[PDB]
């Protein structure tokens, strides 16, 4: 409620401005240990959860490293586009210069001024199976 | 209305039938001969502008052949993607072998079952300024 519910807010607040400043991918366990560092006080069981909510409501992308583990960054202000989840919302980080090339010349092709693009892939994920 | 309305309608559902038929691109002269071939009187100004409606509402795909002509087609049934007009509504078929590739090895590449995808382009067109 008033002690919980806004300590709650607050938390995610916290978490949601360390990674304003990353300017890349992090685990949740390494993003628990700068908090840390940084004078708050909030359990790594409370940030998986909320970099869960970011990784699938599309705040925060991700990856899964040779290890096993989750990654995660704010969505990363260069140029790119999103592989999406149907089932859970995880969204992935994806790319490529000669794609991007194809889509800017085929509109100079035909004669075409102020071009613009979107590229979406989704898909079932590995763990949603 | 009845005598003009109804034989409107009934002008363009015989365009739109030649449409189904044919698989290959077609300017406007071309499509009028066809119907007066098949027995239709259907004057050119009326085709033209059927077509036109059609090219900007997304029903025909259309081109600009190197005389200067528009050509048409009902949309091609075969995979593909579209450039669009944000003024007029001009629909232009695209694609690419390698532009398609890079989407399918990038999907079962993070571990994806159920693999979809949309690419879809915009700009103002030529004739647009
Ligand atoms: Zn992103
Ligand atoms: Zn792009
Ligand atoms: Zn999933
Ligand atoms: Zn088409
Ligand atoms: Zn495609
Ligand atoms: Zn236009």
Redesign the interface.
Known sequence: ASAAGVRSTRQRAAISTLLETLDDFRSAQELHDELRRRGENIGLTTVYRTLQSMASSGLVDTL?TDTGESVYRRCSEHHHHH?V??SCGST?E?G?H??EA??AE??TK?????????????????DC?
């Open positions: 899964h592989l989840c149907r992935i994806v490529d000669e794609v194809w889509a085929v509109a035909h004669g075409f001024s102020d071009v613009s693009h979107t590229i979406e892939i989704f898909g079932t994920c590995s199976r």
